[PDB]
């Protein structure tokens, strides 16, 4: 659906992965900082636009962003009907 954007400032507290109710994140193995596993978006197709995730990102200039696209569908719009 919409697009997701990842950066390097992921400290690795993993408050975003516990905040997104849409299963669009996972901590893939990293090496750079003490994190060793940095967040990423494997399952964008279920993005919702709630962006409760970066509100859970404590990093200065929060490490995740979401570029809110234009190719919406019944899934991205979230209708029970």
């Amino acid at each position: 659906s919409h697009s997701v954007k990842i950066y390097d400032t992921c400290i690795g507290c993993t408050q975003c992965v516990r905040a997104c109710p849409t299963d669009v994140l996972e901590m893939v193995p990293w090496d750079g900082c003490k994190a060793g596993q940095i967040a990423a978006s494997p399952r964008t197709e279920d993005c919702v636009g709630c962006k409760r995730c970066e509100t859970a990102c404590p990093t200065d200039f929060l490490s995740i962003r979401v570029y809110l696209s234009n190719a919406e569908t019944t899934r991205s719009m979230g209708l029970a009907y």
């Binding site: 919702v48 636009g49 962006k51 409760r52 809110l68 719009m77 209708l79 029970a80």
Partner: protein, 728 residues
């Protein structure tokens, strides 16, 4: 013992540390009372509620006693005593300095000041008040009782505070209150009435030297003058010992109508009224079960009423009514609101005080005041219902109950509701604008009044009729009809109407129907927020997240304004509309075909001339034939001694536009402007340490709606206040 106040945030652990930014100020005035948000304990909560109630009562006593005192030393009462017609009561004399010197409201007898409109002297025409010194003592008593019960609150919180089982005896609560409070107070007031009120009322028929009229001590044990009138009232003959009450036909009677010598009704009826009510709900309030092993087990009554459509009936409702508080709050608020508005809708056809229908200024002031309070608080009742829904509930004790049975089929209810609202809405308003177009289109035969296409509310007419001839058969021991707007003779005094029968033609139809329309949509909004409070078809975390929050991000498109109190925002807008047009309708009719002047033939020359049958059918007429009259003097109503009060109607528009400014705009814009001003101030080394931050969007919405309501209501009260001054 003064070392404790200046330690702010004493009740919250978070905002107690320090004011980082201006936000810390705002919340200080926001969480000072919801101490349910402080702990889980309850005895503390109850104690706080008791003390707060005592404080409110204290300020009550204070303000009433002070208003008395003003009435004693700066009010032309005792001069207005001998003549309640040719003198207009007043108070609050103007202070003679620059700016307020021309405002001397001179009301005859040289008494300047401010021509008030609250009709307290009317009470002081029934209480029989001669000299202001007794009133001085009254104020002293009021204030000392205020201080007394405040001290009592301090004691019952700091030294001996009540325990916890002291809360939930609603049985003894109802018994004590219902019986002891209401019945004993009412019968005591009736005893005061018969002893003093009607005697001096008798003595106010022909100028019987008011102060010379004796004092109550001259009637406590002096039964001679009490034996002058009412021969059965020698002592009483005490025939109640003999169970005979036929002797007492002197004072304790039943007339039921207007007394053209008092400007109000016959006070004897009110006295016997109060007697009957007293004993009636005394024996009522003696119902429920208490400490003598006798009475209803009320938590079993509701268990019994179930059936096929019921499911399981009213099972399991007391945990809600006692464990939680917001429930009780909401229901009692709704009931009080309704009760108040019926009171308003009530006391313009049965004036219960002397000189009420003859005094055409206090009436609508009291009416509109109470009417506004009614709605203005029933919406709050509904809001507290919703706050109960979000704060207090249970999945366990709420299986299939009459409560749960609606929350399972809400969609059908609300869909049919929307259906009804749409139907009524255009069925009324589009019809109205249709007739508007027809009148503007040289097709007058397509109008809808009597002189055109017909419709007549026969139901109201027939009910009023069957009310007209009530006495004799339905009311044998009754003399006159209950009122005179239904039927009877046009009752009046002087060249001044008291009450005439009211006519319901064609224009009544759409007016009542749009009343119902707006009430329907109001219920729609409020109940919608009610049901869709915890879970929506898209948001399943509402109760999991709160009820005071702005939005849930730009998911699903937009989601802003999905809490509940925004529902009540929209609802309060709508109820504003409702009550505003309601008071419009009431004022215009009761100044168009109920009120005016009178000739020796009883010829009622009304103020306006019956304008509904002429213009209250098309929109352009509604602005012409109402506000042309409602303002044509306010433009020039200033510019002399008893005119100088340039009213803030000219002033309220400004606050209204300033209001609407807050609504249409976001906040990031203001935040950036703030940051630029901060840059400048920091360049000149004046940067305020506490960093300013723009308002939160909910805060801005709140201040916008507040200013909106304030401006509107100020405008309208200015309107009809000056309008009545032009005739009263």
């Amino acid at each position: 013992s003064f070392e404790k106040w200046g330690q702010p945030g004493h009740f919250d652990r978070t905002l107690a540390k320090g004011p980082k930014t201006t936000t810390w100020i705002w919340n200080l005035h926001a969480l000072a009372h919801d101490f349910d948000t402080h702990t889980s304990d309850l005895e503390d909560i109850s104690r706080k509620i008791f003390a707060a109630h005592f404080g409110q009562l204290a300020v009550i006593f204070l303000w009433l006693s002070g208003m008395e005192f003003h009435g004693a030393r700066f009010s032309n009462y005792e001069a207005w005593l001998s003549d309640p017609i040719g003198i207009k009561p007043s108070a609050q004399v103007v202070w003679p300095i620059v700016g307020q010197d021309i405002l001397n409201a001179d009301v005859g007898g040289g008494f300047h000041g401010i021509q008030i409109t609250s009709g307290l002297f009317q009470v002081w025409r029934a209480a029989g008040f001669t000299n202001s010194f007794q009133l001085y003592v009254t104020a002293i008593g009021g204030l000392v009782a205020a201080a007394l019960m405040l001290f009592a609150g301090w004691f019952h919180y700091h030294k001996r505070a009540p325990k916890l089982e002291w809360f939930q005896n609603a049985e003894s609560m109802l018994n004590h209150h219902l019986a002891g409070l209401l019945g004993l107070g009412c019968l005591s007031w009736a005893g005061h009435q018969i002893h003093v009120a009607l005697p001096v009322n008798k003595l106010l028929d022909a100028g019987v030297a008011p102060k010379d009229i004796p004092l109550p001590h001259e009637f406590i044990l002096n039964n001679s003058l009490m034996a002058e009138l009412y021969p059965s009232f020698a002592k009483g003959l005490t025939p109640f010992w003999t169970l005979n009450w036929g002797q007492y036909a002197d004072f304790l009677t039943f007339k039921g109508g207007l007394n053209p010598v008092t400007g109000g009704l016959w006070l004897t009826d009110t006295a016997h009224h109060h007697l009957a009510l007293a004993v009636l709900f005394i024996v009522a309030g003696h119902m429920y079960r208490t400490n003598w092993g006798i009475g209803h087990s009320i938590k079993e009554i509701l268990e019994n009423h179930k059936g096929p459509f019921t499911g399981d009936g009213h099972k399991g409702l007391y945990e809600n009514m006692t464990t939680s508080w917001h429930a009780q709050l909401g229901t009692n608020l709704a009931m009080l609101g309704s009760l108040t508005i019926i009171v308003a809708h009530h006391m313009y056809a049965m004036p219960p005080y002397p000189y009420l229908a003859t005094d055409y200024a206090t009436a609508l002031s009291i009416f509109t005041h109470h009417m506004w309070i009614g709605g203005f608080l029933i919406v709050g009742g509904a809001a507290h219902a919703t706050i109960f829904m979000v704060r207090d509930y249970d999945p366990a004790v709420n299986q299939n109950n009459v409560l749960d049975r609606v929350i399972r089929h809400r969609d059908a209810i609300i869909s049919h509701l929307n259906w009804v609202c749409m139907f009524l809405g255009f069925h009324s308003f589009g019809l109205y604008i249709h007739n508007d177009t027809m009148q503007a289109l040289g097709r007058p035969q397509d109008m809808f009044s009597d002189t055109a296409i017909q419709l007549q509310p026969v139901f109201a007419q027939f009910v009023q009729n069957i009310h007209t001839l009530a006495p004799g058969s339905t009311a044998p021991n009754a003399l006159e009809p209950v009122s005179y707007a239904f039927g009877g003779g046009v009752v009046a005094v002087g060249g001044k109407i008291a009450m005439m029968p009211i006519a319901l033609g064609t224009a009544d139809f759409m007016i009542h129907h749009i009343h119902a329309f707006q009430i329907h949509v109001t219920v729609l909004i409020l109940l919608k927020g009610f049901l869709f409070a915890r879970n929506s078809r898209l948001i399943p975390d509402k109760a999991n997240l709160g009820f005071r929050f702005p939005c849930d991000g730009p998911g699903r498109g937009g989601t802003c304004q999905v809490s509940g109190w925004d529902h009540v925002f929209l609802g309060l807008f709508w109820m504003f509309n409702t009550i505003a047009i309601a008071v419009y309708h009431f004022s215009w009719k009761m100044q168009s075909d109920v009120w005016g002047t009178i000739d020796p033939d009883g010829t009622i020359a009304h103020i306006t001339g019956g304008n509904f049958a002429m213009s209250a059918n098309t929109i352009n007429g509604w602005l012409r034939d109402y506000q042309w009259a409602q303002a044509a003097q306010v433009i020039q109503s200033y510019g002399s001694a008893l005119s100088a009060y340039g009213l803030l109607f000219l002033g309220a528009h400004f606050v209204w536009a300033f209001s609407l400014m807050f609504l249409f705009s976001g906040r990031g814009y203001w935040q950036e402007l703030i940051e630029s001003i901060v840059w400048a101030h920091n360049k000149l080394k004046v940067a305020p340490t506490i960093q300013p931050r723009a308002l939160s969007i909910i805060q801005g919405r709140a201040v916008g709606v507040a200013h909106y309501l304030l401006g509107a209501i100020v405008t309208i009260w200015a309107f009809f206040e000056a309008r009545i001054i032009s005739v009263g």
